[PDB]
Paper text:
Apoptosis inhibitor 5 (API5, also called AAC-11 or FIF) is a nuclear protein that inhibits apoptosis in human cells. The crystal structure of API5 suggests that it functions as a protein-protein interaction mediator with HEAT (at the N-terminal half) and ARM-like (at the C-terminal half) repeat protein binding modules. FGF2 is a well-known mitogenic growth factor. By integrating structural, proteomic, and functional studies, we unexpectedly found that API5 and FGF2 function in mRNA export in mammalian cells by directly interacting with UAP56 (ATP-dependent RNA helicase), an essential component of various mRNA export machineries, and thereby regulate the expression of several specific oncogenes.
To investigate the function of the API5–FGF2 complex and its potential role in cancer, we determined the crystal structure of the API5–LMW FGF2 complex at a resolution of 2.6 Å. The obtained structure revealed that FGF2 binds to the central region of the API5 helical repeat and provided a detailed picture of the protein-protein interaction interface. There were few structural changes from the previously determined API5- or FGF2-only structures when the two proteins interacted with each other, suggesting that the interface structures are preformed and structurally rigid: i.e. formed by conformational selection mechanism rather than interacting through induced fit. The major interaction force between the interface is the multiple electrostatic interactions when the surface charge distribution of the interface areas and salt-dependent decrease of the API5–FGF2 interaction are considered. Twenty residues in API5 and 14 residues in FGF2 directly participate in protein-protein interactions. Among these, seven highly conserved mainly negatively charged residues in API5 (Asp145 in the α8−α9 loop, Glu184/Asp185 in the α10−α11 loop, Glu190 in α11, Glu219 in α12, Asp222 in the α12−α13 loop and Arg237 in α13) form hydrogen bonds or salt bridges with FGF2. This region in API5 corresponds to the ‘convex’ side of the structure, which is also the central region of the API5 helical repeat that connects the HEAT (α1−α11) and ARM-like (α12−α19) helical repeats. Seven positively charged residues on the surface of FGF2 (Asn169 in the β1−β2 loop, Arg223 in β7, Arg262/Thr263 in the β10−β11 loop; Lys 267 in β11; and Lys271 and Lys277 in the β11−β12 loop) form hydrogen bonds or salt bridges with API5. Taken together, the interacting residues can be divided into segments of highly conserved basic (FGF2) or acidic (API5) regions (FGF2-segment 1, 261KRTGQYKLGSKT272; API5-segment 1, 142QGEDIVR148; API5-segment 2, 183LEDVTGEEF191; and API5-segment 3, 219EQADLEQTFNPSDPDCVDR237). The API5-interacting region of FGF2 largely overlaps with the heparin-binding region of FGF2, and the FGFR1-binding region of FGF2 is located on the opposite side of FGF2.
Residue numbers in the entry:
A (entry chain B): 161 to 286
B (entry chain A): 2 to 322, 336 to 396, 400 to 446
The structure:
Amino acid sequence: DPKRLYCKNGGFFLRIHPDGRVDGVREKSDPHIKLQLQAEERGVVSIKGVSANRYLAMKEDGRLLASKSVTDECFFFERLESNNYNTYRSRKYTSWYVALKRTGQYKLGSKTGPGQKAILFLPMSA
Amino acid sequence: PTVEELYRNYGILADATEQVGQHKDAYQVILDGVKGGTKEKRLAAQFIPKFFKHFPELADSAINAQLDLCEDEDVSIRRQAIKELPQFATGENLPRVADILTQLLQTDDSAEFNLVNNALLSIFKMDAKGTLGGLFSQILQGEDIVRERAIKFLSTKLKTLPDEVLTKEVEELILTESKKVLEDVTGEEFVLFMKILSGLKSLQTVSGRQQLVELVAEQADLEQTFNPSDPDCVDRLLQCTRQAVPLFSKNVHSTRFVTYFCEQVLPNLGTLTTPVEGLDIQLEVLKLLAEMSSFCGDMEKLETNLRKLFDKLLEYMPLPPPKLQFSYVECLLYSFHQLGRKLPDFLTAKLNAEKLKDFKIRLQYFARGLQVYIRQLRLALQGEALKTEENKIKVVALKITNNINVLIKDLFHIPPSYKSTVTLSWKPV
C-alpha cells in the first residue's frame, strides 16, 4: 500500500523529485509525494518515490538525496512513536534522522536528534 | 466569601504593621476569594499579590489562585491579575511566571496584550536570564502561535529595556539561544533574529559583526551547490544574503559571498526564473553583488572569478557594428571596477593585450550611446515635478548613466585606473 509521509513540523509531505531532490510540500495531491515503504530486515524500511522511481537516501554529510538505485544509504530504522508518527533513522549513520524543516527543505542529519518535531512523520492513506 | 469579608481581612493584613505573618487565616480568606463571583474575584486579583511577600508557606496556593484569575472568562478579571504577576516572581517562582507570561502573549485583546508585555519587561528587569529561559523554551518547543509572539517580543521590546539590564552575559545568552533556534527558522523568522542579534551592543563591534556574518553564511548554506532552476533557491539566497550587507565594513569582509555569486550564480544568470510580477530577478542578483564587491578581500580563485565577472560584463557591452541595459552595466562595471584592483594584470599583461584592446573598443562604443542618453535625460530635466513617478525614473537614470560614465573614463586610462569612487544609484546619500 502506497503512503504519504506527513511531517509534524510545519505539515509538509515528503516529496521525491525525478532529478533527486528531497523536500516537503503542503499540497495534498502532489505526484511526487506518493511513497512506497519496502520492508527489509526487521525494523528497517526503504522509501521509494513512485513518480520519481528513486529511493530516499542520506549521504556522508547528512544531506537527503534520491538515487535511482538502492545503495547502502537507502535503509532506515522505522520506530513507531506517538501518535501514529514514525521516525526514520539512517542505518549507516545511526545518529541522523530524516527530517524536514519549517522552511520545507530537508534538515541536515548532523543537526537532527531524538525528540524533535522535524523527525516525526505520519503515514497517510491514498 | 463576599466583598465585605475581603475588605475586612484586607484591613487586618494592612493594619498589622509588622505582625503580618501571624494573620495567615486572614490571607487564606483572600485566597478563597477566587471562588467568589465577579466583584469577589476583582478584589482577589489585587489583594493576593499585595500580601504575597508575607506568606512564603502559601506560595504555591497563591500563585495558583492568581493563575486561575489569569484564565478567567472575563477579560477585565484577567487584566487585573496579569498586571500583578511580577509580584509573584520572587525566588524560585520567576521561571514559572515567565512561562505563564510567555503563554499569555497569544491574547488578542489590545489592553491585555499590553499588560502581558509590561509584566514580561518587569520580570526582565528582575531576572533577565530567567525570563529569557521562559521565552526561548517556548520558541524552541511551544506552539507556532507562542513562538511567533515571543520572537516579536524580542524583536520589538528589547530596545525598550535599560542598558543596565542587558548586561554582557544577557547578550551572550541571547546569542547562545538564538543559534539554537536558527537551525530551524523560516525566511521571515531569520530576518527578525538578525535584527535582534545585530541590535546587541556586544555584537556591534568589528569582531561582533564578523560573527553575525558567519551566522548568515551557515544559514545561506554556501557549500550547497547552486541550482538555477529552482525559483525558491534564488529567493532564499537573496533574502539570506541581504541580511549580511548591513554588516560589511572594510574589516568585515564579504569574500565568502562574492566568491559564491561569481563562481555559481553569474555563469548561470540567464537561467534565473522569477515567480513574482514586476521583479527583475537578474538585476536584483547584480544589485546585491555590486553592494558586496566593495567589501571583498583576497579571493580563493581570484582570476577565475574575475574572468567570469568580466565575461558577463562583455555580454552587456556590445562591439560596434541595439538597446543598452544601463541598469545591468552599472552593477557589472562597478563590481569589476572593485575586484579589478586586486589583479591589474587582468588588463595590463602582455598576454591580455588582446583582451585590453577589445575591452577599450567596447568601452568607447558604449560611451557614445551613453553620453547621448545623458544629455537626452538632462534635456527633459530642465523640486515638485521631480517627485513624480515619471520624473523620478529619469533622476535615478541620470545617476546610473553618470556612474557608468565615471567608471568608463577611469578604465580608459592607458594604464587602466581604479581609484574613482561612485555611489550606487539605488543607495541614498
